[PDB]
PDB file of C-alpha atoms and ligand atoms in Angstrom:
ATOM      1  CA  UNK A   1     126.849 186.291 204.286  1.00  9.68           C
ATOM      2  CA  UNK A   2     128.282 188.459 207.166  1.00 11.35           C
ATOM      3  CA  UNK A   3     126.756 185.623 209.167  1.00 11.00           C
ATOM      4  CA  UNK A   4     128.320 182.657 207.275  1.00  9.75           C
ATOM      5  CA  UNK A   5     131.684 184.408 207.812  1.00  6.68           C
ATOM      6  CA  UNK A   6     130.922 184.865 211.529  1.00  9.42           C
ATOM      7  CA  UNK A   7     129.959 181.111 211.811  1.00  9.82           C
ATOM      8  CA  UNK A   8     133.240 180.194 210.145  1.00 10.27           C
ATOM      9  CA  UNK A   9     135.339 182.256 212.586  1.00  9.38           C
ATOM     10  CA  UNK A  10     133.329 180.611 215.453  1.00  9.81           C
ATOM     11  CA  UNK A  11     133.786 177.052 214.143  1.00  9.23           C
ATOM     12  CA  UNK A  12     137.471 177.731 213.754  1.00  9.64           C
ATOM     13  CA  UNK A  13     137.739 178.953 217.295  1.00 10.32           C
ATOM     14  CA  UNK A  14     135.987 175.754 218.447  1.00  7.62           C
ATOM     15  CA  UNK A  15     138.464 173.625 216.462  1.00  7.91           C
ATOM     16  CA  UNK A  16     141.433 175.281 218.113  1.00  4.70           C
ATOM     17  CA  UNK A  17     139.858 174.950 221.572  1.00  4.96           C
ATOM     18  CA  UNK A  18     139.681 171.072 221.338  1.00  4.12           C
ATOM     19  CA  UNK A  19     143.257 170.689 222.449  1.00  6.42           C
ATOM     20  CA  UNK A  20     143.526 173.566 224.874  1.00  7.57           C
ATOM     21  CA  UNK A  21     143.736 173.052 228.607  1.00  6.22           C
ATOM     22  CA  UNK A  22     140.741 173.340 230.916  1.00  4.29           C
ATOM     23  CA  UNK A  23     140.746 176.852 232.375  1.00  2.00           C
ATOM     24  CA  UNK A  24     138.201 175.983 235.074  1.00  2.62           C
ATOM     25  CA  UNK A  25     135.230 173.798 235.893  1.00  4.67           C
ATOM     26  CA  UNK A  26     131.686 174.669 236.997  1.00  9.55           C
ATOM     27  CA  UNK A  27     128.858 172.860 238.620  1.00 12.43           C
ATOM     28  CA  UNK A  28     125.512 174.078 237.322  1.00 13.38           C
ATOM     29  CA  UNK A  29     122.686 175.346 239.531  1.00 13.19           C
ATOM     30  CA  UNK A  30     120.212 175.585 236.684  1.00 12.20           C
ATOM     31  CA  UNK A  31     119.230 173.651 233.637  1.00 13.19           C
ATOM     32  CA  UNK A  32     119.740 174.943 230.023  1.00 17.39           C
ATOM     33  CA  UNK A  33     118.002 173.431 227.066  1.00 22.20           C
ATOM     34  CA  UNK A  34     119.285 174.966 223.919  1.00 22.08           C
ATOM     35  CA  UNK A  35     116.922 176.476 221.334  1.00 24.32           C
ATOM     36  CA  UNK A  36     117.431 177.866 217.860  1.00 24.84           C
ATOM     37  CA  UNK A  37     116.435 181.393 219.040  1.00 23.17           C
ATOM     38  CA  UNK A  38     119.421 181.472 221.460  1.00 23.01           C
ATOM     39  CA  UNK A  39     121.544 182.617 218.531  1.00 26.05           C
ATOM     40  CA  UNK A  40     124.399 180.169 219.125  1.00 29.79           C
ATOM     41  CA  UNK A  41     127.743 181.207 217.459  1.00 32.05           C
ATOM     42  CA  UNK A  42     127.541 177.895 215.547  1.00 33.07           C
ATOM     43  CA  UNK A  43     123.976 176.716 215.178  1.00 30.07           C
ATOM     44  CA  UNK A  44     123.469 173.285 216.681  1.00 30.57           C
ATOM     45  CA  UNK A  45     126.697 173.436 218.803  1.00 28.96           C
ATOM     46  CA  UNK A  46     125.292 174.676 222.116  1.00 31.54           C
ATOM     47  CA  UNK A  47     125.917 172.485 225.226  1.00 33.20           C
ATOM     48  CA  UNK A  48     122.579 171.752 226.995  1.00 33.03           C
ATOM     49  CA  UNK A  49     122.716 170.653 230.620  1.00 37.75           C
ATOM     50  CA  UNK A  50     120.695 169.883 233.734  1.00 38.49           C
ATOM     51  CA  UNK A  51     121.162 171.346 237.200  1.00 40.48           C
ATOM     52  CA  UNK A  52     124.049 169.739 239.127  1.00 36.98           C
ATOM     53  CA  UNK A  53     125.942 168.864 235.891  1.00 36.38           C
ATOM     54  CA  UNK A  54     129.686 169.561 235.571  1.00 36.21           C
ATOM     55  CA  UNK A  55     131.293 171.504 232.707  1.00 39.98           C
ATOM     56  CA  UNK A  56     134.908 171.972 231.783  1.00 39.95           C
ATOM     57  CA  UNK A  57     135.502 175.484 230.354  1.00 40.38           C
ATOM     58  CA  UNK A  58     138.334 176.109 227.901  1.00 41.17           C
ATOM     59  CA  UNK A  59     137.885 179.741 226.968  1.00 41.24           C
ATOM     60  CA  UNK A  60     135.639 182.750 226.644  1.00 44.44           C
ATOM     61  CA  UNK A  61     134.287 183.179 223.093  1.00 45.35           C
ATOM     62  CA  UNK A  62     132.469 186.529 223.815  1.00 44.40           C
ATOM     63  CA  UNK A  63     130.280 188.118 226.544  1.00 42.89           C
ATOM     64  CA  UNK A  64     127.471 185.684 225.842  1.00 42.07           C
ATOM     65  CA  UNK A  65     129.333 182.390 225.136  1.00 41.77           C
ATOM     66  CA  UNK A  66     132.058 180.240 226.561  1.00 41.31           C
ATOM     67  CA  UNK A  67     133.617 177.240 224.938  1.00 38.31           C
ATOM     68  CA  UNK A  68     133.707 173.915 226.891  1.00 40.82           C
ATOM     69  CA  UNK A  69     132.132 170.527 227.408  1.00 40.32           C
ATOM     70  CA  UNK A  70     129.992 168.418 229.680  1.00 37.21           C
ATOM     71  CA  UNK A  71     132.127 166.165 231.830  1.00 36.11           C
ATOM     72  CA  UNK A  72     130.788 162.929 230.357  1.00 37.65           C
ATOM     73  CA  UNK A  73     132.247 160.278 228.047  1.00 35.62           C
ATOM     74  CA  UNK A  74     131.453 160.940 224.403  1.00 34.17           C
ATOM     75  CA  UNK A  75     130.669 164.650 224.977  1.00 35.69           C
ATOM     76  CA  UNK A  76     132.796 167.103 222.962  1.00 36.80           C
ATOM     77  CA  UNK A  77     133.299 170.846 223.160  1.00 34.62           C
ATOM     78  CA  UNK A  78     130.664 173.341 222.108  1.00 34.85           C
ATOM     79  CA  UNK A  79     129.234 176.658 223.238  1.00 33.86           C
ATOM     80  CA  UNK A  80     128.093 177.191 226.814  1.00 34.54           C
ATOM     81  CA  UNK A  81     125.981 180.264 227.681  1.00 33.94           C
ATOM     82  CA  UNK A  82     127.694 182.793 229.922  1.00 36.28           C
ATOM     83  CA  UNK A  83     125.782 183.914 233.071  1.00 33.94           C
ATOM     84  CA  UNK A  84     124.958 187.156 231.149  1.00 33.54           C
ATOM     85  CA  UNK A  85     123.396 185.121 228.355  1.00 35.98           C
ATOM     86  CA  UNK A  86     121.475 182.853 230.753  1.00 34.54           C
ATOM     87  CA  UNK A  87     120.056 185.937 232.506  1.00 36.58           C
ATOM     88  CA  UNK A  88     119.125 187.497 229.114  1.00 37.67           C
ATOM     89  CA  UNK A  89     117.277 184.278 228.124  1.00 37.21           C
ATOM     90  CA  UNK A  90     115.570 184.155 231.495  1.00 40.98           C
ATOM     91  CA  UNK A  91     114.311 187.733 230.916  1.00 42.78           C
ATOM     92  CA  UNK A  92     113.226 186.910 227.358  1.00 44.43           C
ATOM     93  CA  UNK A  93     111.009 184.132 228.838  1.00 43.75           C
ATOM     94  CA  UNK A  94     109.744 186.399 231.573  1.00 42.30           C
ATOM     95  CA  UNK A  95     108.891 189.177 229.062  1.00 39.84           C
ATOM     96  CA  UNK A  96     107.112 186.681 226.735  1.00 40.88           C
ATOM     97  CA  UNK A  97     105.239 185.217 229.722  1.00 39.48           C
ATOM     98  CA  UNK A  98     104.079 188.675 231.076  1.00 40.36           C
ATOM     99  CA  UNK A  99     106.107 195.539 247.120  1.00 42.21           C
ATOM    100  CA  UNK A 100     107.985 193.578 249.856  1.00 42.45           C
ATOM    101  CA  UNK A 101     108.871 190.167 248.120  1.00 43.51           C
ATOM    102  CA  UNK A 102     120.815 182.636 242.293  1.00 45.00           C
ATOM    103  CA  UNK A 103     124.165 182.288 240.281  1.00 47.32           C
ATOM    104  CA  UNK A 104     123.884 179.695 237.526  1.00 49.18           C
ATOM    105  CA  UNK A 105     127.404 178.294 237.940  1.00 48.77           C
ATOM    106  CA  UNK A 106     129.667 177.566 240.908  1.00 45.75           C
ATOM    107  CA  UNK A 107     133.429 177.272 240.230  1.00 44.01           C
ATOM    108  CA  UNK A 108     134.613 173.808 241.406  1.00 43.35           C
ATOM    109  CA  UNK A 109     137.875 171.855 241.154  1.00 41.89           C
ATOM    110  CA  UNK A 110     138.601 170.610 237.639  1.00 43.54           C
ATOM    111  CA  UNK A 111     138.713 167.033 239.012  1.00 41.96           C
ATOM    112  CA  UNK A 112     136.264 166.398 241.834  1.00 41.73           C
ATOM    113  CA  UNK A 113     138.248 165.398 244.909  1.00 44.24           C
ATOM    114  CA  UNK A 114     137.486 161.929 246.234  1.00 45.18           C
ATOM    115  CA  UNK A 115     136.455 161.776 249.879  1.00 42.77           C
ATOM    116  CA  UNK A 116     135.868 158.573 251.871  1.00 39.61           C
ATOM    117  CA  UNK A 117     133.134 158.416 254.534  1.00 38.34           C
ATOM    118  CA  UNK A 118     132.245 155.422 256.667  1.00 40.58           C
ATOM    119  CA  UNK A 119     131.753 152.808 257.778  1.00 42.82           C
ATOM    120  CA  UNK A 120     131.763 154.747 261.067  1.00 44.91           C
ATOM    121  CA  UNK A 121     133.852 157.654 262.520  1.00 43.70           C
ATOM    122  CA  UNK A 122     137.404 158.500 261.608  1.00 42.81           C
ATOM    123  CA  UNK A 123     139.942 158.313 264.452  1.00 42.62           C
ATOM    124  CA  UNK A 124     138.657 154.875 265.558  1.00 40.58           C
ATOM    125  CA  UNK A 125     140.281 151.626 264.417  1.00 41.38           C
ATOM    126  CA  UNK A 126     137.579 149.990 262.319  1.00 43.12           C
ATOM    127  CA  UNK A 127     137.099 153.021 259.984  1.00 42.74           C
ATOM    128  CA  UNK A 128     140.769 154.032 260.025  1.00 44.45           C
ATOM    129  CA  UNK A 129     142.036 150.536 259.088  1.00 43.86           C
ATOM    130  CA  UNK A 130     139.342 149.922 256.493  1.00 48.15           C
ATOM    131  CA  UNK A 131     140.004 153.244 254.840  1.00 51.58           C
ATOM    132  CA  UNK A 132     143.798 152.841 255.021  1.00 51.09           C
ATOM    133  CA  UNK A 133     143.527 149.643 252.922  1.00 52.61           C
ATOM    134  CA  UNK A 134     141.532 151.585 250.229  1.00 53.52           C
ATOM    135  CA  UNK A 135     143.962 154.515 250.195  1.00 53.00           C
ATOM    136  CA  UNK A 136     146.923 151.996 249.908  1.00 51.37           C
ATOM    137  CA  UNK A 137     145.183 150.399 246.961  1.00 51.90           C
ATOM    138  CA  UNK A 138     144.510 153.744 245.181  1.00 53.66           C
ATOM    139  CA  UNK A 139     148.152 154.808 245.554  1.00 56.09           C
ATOM    140  CA  UNK A 140     149.368 151.690 243.736  1.00 59.53           C
ATOM    141  CA  UNK A 141     146.586 151.372 241.201  1.00 62.36           C
ATOM    142  CA  UNK A 142     146.600 154.994 239.910  1.00 63.72           C
ATOM    143  CA  UNK A 143     150.353 155.715 240.165  1.00 62.52           C
ATOM    144  CA  UNK A 144     151.237 158.508 237.711  1.00 62.75           C
ATOM    145  CA  UNK A 145     147.643 159.757 237.638  1.00 62.04           C
ATOM    146  CA  UNK A 146     146.769 160.524 241.286  1.00 58.63           C
ATOM    147  CA  UNK A 147     147.558 162.806 244.211  1.00 61.47           C
ATOM    148  CA  UNK A 148     146.513 161.594 247.602  1.00 61.13           C
ATOM    149  CA  UNK A 149     146.833 164.192 250.401  1.00 63.31           C
ATOM    150  CA  UNK A 150     145.826 164.458 253.999  1.00 63.80           C
ATOM    151  CA  UNK A 151     143.663 167.363 255.112  1.00 67.60           C
ATOM    152  CA  UNK A 152     143.641 167.987 258.841  1.00 69.03           C
ATOM    153  CA  UNK A 153     141.948 171.410 258.511  1.00 69.47           C
ATOM    154  CA  UNK A 154     138.212 171.479 259.033  1.00 67.62           C
ATOM    155  CA  UNK A 155     137.137 172.030 255.435  1.00 68.38           C
ATOM    156  CA  UNK A 156     133.439 171.796 256.409  1.00 67.99           C
ATOM    157  CA  UNK A 157     134.023 175.470 257.435  1.00 63.56           C
ATOM    158  CA  UNK A 158     134.664 176.493 253.808  1.00 65.72           C
ATOM    159  CA  UNK A 159     131.314 178.175 253.190  1.00 67.21           C
ATOM    160  CA  UNK A 160     130.436 181.953 253.022  1.00 70.89           C
ATOM    161  CA  UNK A 161     128.211 181.305 256.220  1.00 69.67           C
ATOM    162  CA  UNK A 162     131.575 181.019 258.101  1.00 65.87           C
ATOM    163  CA  UNK A 163     134.209 183.118 256.087  1.00 66.33           C
ATOM    164  CA  UNK A 164     137.328 180.123 265.179  1.00 64.03           C
ATOM    165  CA  UNK A 165     140.636 182.097 265.094  1.00 61.07           C
ATOM    166  CA  UNK A 166     141.514 184.155 262.081  1.00 59.56           C
ATOM    167  CA  UNK A 167     144.480 181.871 261.577  1.00 60.77           C
ATOM    168  CA  UNK A 168     142.364 178.653 261.471  1.00 61.01           C
ATOM    169  CA  UNK A 169     139.928 180.139 258.939  1.00 64.22           C
ATOM    170  CA  UNK A 170     142.805 181.310 256.748  1.00 65.29           C
ATOM    171  CA  UNK A 171     144.184 177.802 256.944  1.00 66.93           C
ATOM    172  CA  UNK A 172     140.848 176.329 255.757  1.00 66.89           C
ATOM    173  CA  UNK A 173     140.940 178.714 252.765  1.00 68.32           C
ATOM    174  CA  UNK A 174     144.518 177.848 251.953  1.00 66.78           C
ATOM    175  CA  UNK A 175     143.552 174.141 251.972  1.00 68.51           C
ATOM    176  CA  UNK A 176     140.669 174.759 249.554  1.00 65.70           C
ATOM    177  CA  UNK A 177     143.018 176.674 247.276  1.00 63.63           C
ATOM    178  CA  UNK A 178     145.546 173.771 247.440  1.00 61.09           C
ATOM    179  CA  UNK A 179     142.929 171.185 246.507  1.00 62.14           C
ATOM    180  CA  UNK A 180     141.816 173.309 243.501  1.00 61.54           C
ATOM    181  CA  UNK A 181     145.486 173.576 242.473  1.00 61.72           C
ATOM    182  CA  UNK A 182     146.108 169.802 242.759  1.00 60.44           C
ATOM    183  CA  UNK A 183     143.285 169.227 240.264  1.00 58.95           C
ATOM    184  CA  UNK A 184     144.213 171.969 237.781  1.00 53.63           C
ATOM    185  CA  UNK A 185     146.155 169.585 235.435  1.00 49.87           C
ATOM    186  CA  UNK A 186     143.449 166.926 235.566  1.00 50.45           C
ATOM    187  CA  UNK A 187     145.101 164.372 237.836  1.00 50.09           C
ATOM    188  CA  UNK A 188     142.779 162.378 240.112  1.00 48.55           C
ATOM    189  CA  UNK A 189     142.700 164.001 243.590  1.00 51.69           C
ATOM    190  CA  UNK A 190     142.026 161.932 246.740  1.00 51.28           C
ATOM    191  CA  UNK A 191     141.686 163.540 250.114  1.00 51.89           C
ATOM    192  CA  UNK A 192     142.147 161.870 253.451  1.00 53.00           C
ATOM    193  CA  UNK A 193     139.935 164.460 255.205  1.00 50.90           C
ATOM    194  CA  UNK A 194     140.151 163.922 258.924  1.00 50.32           C
ATOM    195  CA  UNK A 195     137.043 165.939 259.891  1.00 51.00           C
ATOM    196  CA  UNK A 196     134.554 164.714 257.216  1.00 52.56           C
ATOM    197  CA  UNK A 197     132.370 161.789 258.342  1.00 52.43           C
ATOM    198  CA  UNK A 198     129.176 162.677 256.548  1.00 53.48           C
ATOM    199  CA  UNK A 199     128.436 164.138 253.089  1.00 51.63           C
ATOM    200  CA  UNK A 200     126.348 166.972 254.454  1.00 51.79           C
ATOM    201  CA  UNK A 201     129.586 168.380 255.881  1.00 50.80           C
ATOM    202  CA  UNK A 202     130.785 169.270 252.320  1.00 49.71           C
ATOM    203  CA  UNK A 203     127.490 169.888 250.553  1.00 50.88           C
ATOM    204  CA  UNK A 204     127.718 173.663 251.101  1.00 53.49           C
ATOM    205  CA  UNK A 205     131.326 174.013 249.975  1.00 50.48           C
ATOM    206  CA  UNK A 206     132.625 174.573 246.458  1.00 54.15           C
ATOM    207  CA  UNK A 207     134.631 171.321 246.518  1.00 52.70           C
ATOM    208  CA  UNK A 208     131.935 169.218 244.856  1.00 55.41           C
ATOM    209  CA  UNK A 209     133.547 165.989 246.057  1.00 51.56           C
ATOM    210  CA  UNK A 210     133.172 162.435 244.858  1.00 51.30           C
ATOM    211  CA  UNK A 211     131.758 160.946 248.053  1.00 51.51           C
ATOM    212  CA  UNK A 212     132.719 157.283 248.533  1.00 51.19           C
ATOM    213  CA  UNK A 213     130.543 155.571 251.089  1.00 48.59           C
ATOM    214  CA  UNK A 214     132.340 152.581 252.669  1.00 51.52           C
ATOM    215  CA  UNK A 215     129.122 150.916 253.924  1.00 54.53           C
ATOM    216  CA  UNK A 216     128.763 147.974 256.341  1.00 53.93           C
ATOM    217  CA  UNK A 217     125.157 146.915 255.625  1.00 54.16           C
ATOM    218  CA  UNK A 218     124.551 145.170 258.967  1.00 55.27           C
ATOM    219  CA  UNK A 219     124.893 147.038 262.301  1.00 56.75           C
ATOM    220  CA  UNK A 220     125.472 143.689 264.002  1.00 58.53           C
ATOM    221  CA  UNK A 221     128.549 143.152 261.834  1.00 57.39           C
ATOM    222  CA  UNK A 222     129.876 146.640 262.635  1.00 57.83           C
ATOM    223  CA  UNK A 223     129.396 146.076 266.322  1.00 58.23           C
ATOM    224  CA  UNK A 224     131.317 142.807 266.190  1.00 59.38           C
ATOM    225  CA  UNK A 225     134.106 144.433 264.161  1.00 57.59           C
ATOM    226  CA  UNK A 226     134.471 147.148 266.794  1.00 54.82           C
ATOM    227  CA  UNK A 227     134.613 144.434 269.450  1.00 59.27           C
ATOM    228  CA  UNK A 228     137.312 142.629 267.481  1.00 59.12           C
ATOM    229  CA  UNK A 229     139.542 145.663 268.188  1.00 55.65           C
ATOM    230  CA  UNK A 230     139.337 145.050 271.949  1.00 53.34           C
ATOM    231  CA  UNK A 231     137.759 146.809 274.963  1.00 54.24           C
ATOM    232  CA  UNK A 232     139.732 149.994 274.313  1.00 57.07           C
ATOM    233  CA  UNK A 233     137.650 150.501 271.059  1.00 56.56           C
ATOM    234  CA  UNK A 234     134.506 148.804 272.224  1.00 56.35           C
ATOM    235  CA  UNK A 235     134.100 151.323 275.041  1.00 57.55           C
ATOM    236  CA  UNK A 236     133.413 153.779 272.204  1.00 56.96           C
ATOM    237  CA  UNK A 237     130.757 151.562 270.596  1.00 57.27           C
ATOM    238  CA  UNK A 238     127.846 153.956 270.847  1.00 58.65           C
ATOM    239  CA  UNK A 239     129.321 156.963 269.128  1.00 62.78           C
ATOM    240  CA  UNK A 240     130.547 154.671 266.282  1.00 62.15           C
ATOM    241  CA  UNK A 241     127.139 152.977 265.864  1.00 61.01           C
ATOM    242  CA  UNK A 242     125.223 156.320 265.824  1.00 61.89           C
ATOM    243  CA  UNK A 243     127.556 157.670 263.150  1.00 56.56           C
ATOM    244  CA  UNK A 244     127.084 154.548 260.915  1.00 57.88           C
ATOM    245  CA  UNK A 245     123.312 154.814 261.366  1.00 56.06           C
ATOM    246  CA  UNK A 246     123.379 158.504 260.242  1.00 54.39           C
ATOM    247  CA  UNK A 247     125.107 157.421 257.027  1.00 56.94           C
ATOM    248  CA  UNK A 248     122.502 154.717 256.528  1.00 60.66           C
ATOM    249  CA  UNK A 249     119.687 157.313 256.959  1.00 60.85           C
ATOM    250  CA  UNK A 250     120.926 159.416 254.027  1.00 60.67           C
ATOM    251  CA  UNK A 251     119.043 159.414 250.590  1.00 58.40           C
ATOM    252  CA  UNK A 252     121.691 157.516 248.823  1.00 57.03           C
ATOM    253  CA  UNK A 253     121.432 158.656 245.216  1.00 54.44           C
ATOM    254  CA  UNK A 254     121.698 162.305 246.176  1.00 55.91           C
ATOM    255  CA  UNK A 255     124.245 161.820 249.020  1.00 59.13           C
ATOM    256  CA  UNK A 256     126.887 159.420 247.625  1.00 63.90           C
ATOM    257  CA  UNK A 257     128.752 159.038 244.364  1.00 64.95           C
ATOM    258  CA  UNK A 258     129.894 155.442 244.964  1.00 62.13           C
ATOM    259  CA  UNK A 259     128.744 152.966 247.595  1.00 58.48           C
ATOM    260  CA  UNK A 260     131.175 150.212 248.567  1.00 58.02           C
ATOM    261  CA  UNK A 261     129.098 147.660 250.330  1.00 57.40           C
ATOM    262  CA  UNK A 262     131.183 144.650 249.323  1.00 54.95           C
ATOM    263  CA  UNK A 263     132.550 142.571 252.191  1.00 52.09           C
ATOM    264  CA  UNK A 264     135.799 141.680 250.404  1.00 51.66           C
ATOM    265  CA  UNK A 265     138.571 144.254 250.084  1.00 51.50           C
ATOM    266  CA  UNK A 266     139.327 142.969 246.528  1.00 50.74           C
ATOM    267  CA  UNK A 267     135.785 143.572 245.339  1.00 47.56           C
ATOM    268  CA  UNK A 268     135.404 146.956 247.045  1.00 45.75           C
ATOM    269  CA  UNK A 269     138.750 148.077 245.478  1.00 48.68           C
ATOM    270  CA  UNK A 270     137.838 146.920 241.946  1.00 49.58           C
ATOM    271  CA  UNK A 271     134.467 148.672 242.208  1.00 51.54           C
ATOM    272  CA  UNK A 272     136.152 151.955 243.228  1.00 54.42           C
ATOM    273  CA  UNK A 273     138.843 151.533 240.545  1.00 53.15           C
ATOM    274  CA  UNK A 274     136.187 150.923 237.868  1.00 52.26           C
ATOM    275  CA  UNK A 275     134.367 154.079 238.949  1.00 51.44           C
ATOM    276  CA  UNK A 276     137.509 156.207 238.908  1.00 50.47           C
ATOM    277  CA  UNK A 277     138.575 154.821 235.493  1.00 51.61           C
ATOM    278  CA  UNK A 278     135.215 155.822 234.151  1.00 54.15           C
ATOM    279  CA  UNK A 279     135.715 159.297 235.672  1.00 51.94           C
ATOM    280  CA  UNK A 280     139.215 159.442 234.055  1.00 52.20           C
ATOM    281  CA  UNK A 281     137.616 158.780 230.649  1.00 53.32           C
ATOM    282  CA  UNK A 282     134.907 161.404 231.252  1.00 54.74           C
ATOM    283  CA  UNK A 283     137.544 164.070 232.096  1.00 58.00           C
ATOM    284  CA  UNK A 284     140.127 163.042 229.479  1.00 58.23           C
ATOM    285  CA  UNK A 285     138.460 162.893 226.100  1.00 54.36           C
ATOM    286  CA  UNK A 286     140.740 161.570 223.287  1.00 53.91           C
ATOM    287  CA  UNK A 287     139.951 164.780 221.266  1.00 55.28           C
ATOM    288  CA  UNK A 288     142.055 166.706 223.818  1.00 54.91           C
ATOM    289  CA  UNK A 289     145.169 165.699 221.790  1.00 52.36           C
ATOM    290  CA  UNK A 290     145.510 165.091 218.064  1.00 49.99           C
ATOM    291  CA  UNK A 291     147.714 162.119 217.001  1.00 46.75           C
ATOM    292  CA  UNK A 292     151.001 163.358 215.393  1.00 47.79           C
ATOM    293  CA  UNK A 293     151.224 161.120 212.246  1.00 49.96           C
ATOM    294  CA  UNK A 294     154.410 158.882 212.051  1.00 50.69           C
ATOM    295  CA  UNK A 295     154.139 158.828 208.189  1.00 47.64           C
ATOM    296  CA  UNK A 296     153.316 161.710 205.792  1.00 46.54           C
ATOM    297  CA  UNK A 297     151.110 160.992 202.667  1.00 46.93           C
ATOM    298  CA  UNK A 298     153.712 162.405 200.215  1.00 46.68           C
TER     299      UNK A 298
ATOM    300  CA  UNK B   1     128.856 130.185 257.043  1.00 48.01           C
ATOM    301  CA  UNK B   2     125.809 132.488 257.400  1.00 47.92           C
ATOM    302  CA  UNK B   3     125.824 135.827 255.390  1.00 49.59           C
ATOM    303  CA  UNK B   4     126.569 137.722 258.605  1.00 51.08           C
ATOM    304  CA  UNK B   5     129.512 135.412 259.464  1.00 52.10           C
ATOM    305  CA  UNK B   6     130.766 135.714 255.852  1.00 51.46           C
ATOM    306  CA  UNK B   7     130.467 139.576 256.160  1.00 53.15           C
ATOM    307  CA  UNK B   8     132.335 139.531 259.348  1.00 53.73           C
ATOM    308  CA  UNK B   9     135.145 137.306 258.090  1.00 52.53           C
ATOM    309  CA  UNK B  10     135.556 139.456 254.858  1.00 51.15           C
ATOM    310  CA  UNK B  11     135.808 142.677 256.976  1.00 51.90           C
ATOM    311  CA  UNK B  12     138.210 141.159 259.514  1.00 53.53           C
ATOM    312  CA  UNK B  13     140.406 140.038 256.585  1.00 54.89           C
ATOM    313  CA  UNK B  14     140.179 143.590 255.064  1.00 54.48           C
ATOM    314  CA  UNK B  15     141.388 145.032 258.425  1.00 51.99           C
ATOM    315  CA  UNK B  16     144.395 142.640 258.536  1.00 51.33           C
ATOM    316  CA  UNK B  17     145.462 143.928 255.067  1.00 46.97           C
ATOM    317  CA  UNK B  18     145.815 147.347 256.459  1.00 47.55           C
ATOM    318  CA  UNK B  19     148.662 146.380 258.903  1.00 45.59           C
TER     319      UNK B  19
HETATM  320  C1  LIG C 301     137.810 135.181 258.411  1.00 47.84           C
HETATM  321  C2  LIG C 301     139.184 135.159 257.737  1.00 47.84           C
HETATM  322  C3  LIG C 301     139.556 133.941 257.169  1.00 47.84           C
HETATM  323  C4  LIG C 301     140.772 133.840 256.467  1.00 47.84           C
HETATM  324  C5  LIG C 301     141.627 134.950 256.319  1.00 47.84           C
HETATM  325  C6  LIG C 301     141.261 136.192 256.849  1.00 47.84           C
HETATM  326  C7  LIG C 301     142.113 137.423 256.440  1.00 47.84           C
HETATM  327  C8  LIG C 301     140.024 136.261 257.592  1.00 47.84           C
HETATM  328 CL1  LIG C 302     134.615 187.091 233.239  1.00 49.02          CL
END
């Protein structure tokens, strides 16, 4: 009875949160599988998740619960355990289970920035021209919904390990902050990141990019493409081939969000566009605005 | 053309579209 009234006030808060803006996003470091004994503000409305999942957070319900959703099509808002609640549940398990011898959430941009790597190194013609055609395509295809921005700062330095002049490190931080700001209103964000040739270069940052691997499957083809750009590029063959082989050595499922191994620009573009449309849907659930009826019933 | 020649042509065409 005190409890049915509390559930009502909780449900109502959830209702109102459907159409609020996303306050921030997290990437999870742990898994959470909801149980009845977690004492969810509305029973059955907890958001379960696996490690490495993304959540959009609307608001703080209390010290134990936030309100938000999994970034996935079909998923609607519910209650997400706060770090305090996750730690309390962890200790409940440890207490039930029982001299000299890990945050559950990282804050990430609300839209994961897209970053292109491959087919070889940036600053050489084959990779620069191939990527330029993809960026030109994105600009036209997602007009009104996208921000594409160059990043010349070395954003691989954006880890606590680092957090080089004082001025350069402040510039890296200001670029991170800019990229978070570009994503705040849920536009797609595409970075032309001069210094990033390999996904491991961003894996320790809080950017949580969408890594797009522009992959030339055959090294023989790559070599001949470099040669097509003349002796001035071909004299740099080795460094370009080594870089392409490092990409090919990565565990693909864990390293790349999208792999463009199509040999036709049209097909590579439509694959990337299909991916990004799907990501648009995941991040923009229809529930985030109510229709405003044209006609009233009476 | 062989798959490798087809790959190569597709990529060379892709590069021309960047200019
Ligand atoms: C190999 C090739 C044939 C036709 C047109 C282009 C762009 C390339
Ligand atoms: Cl807080």
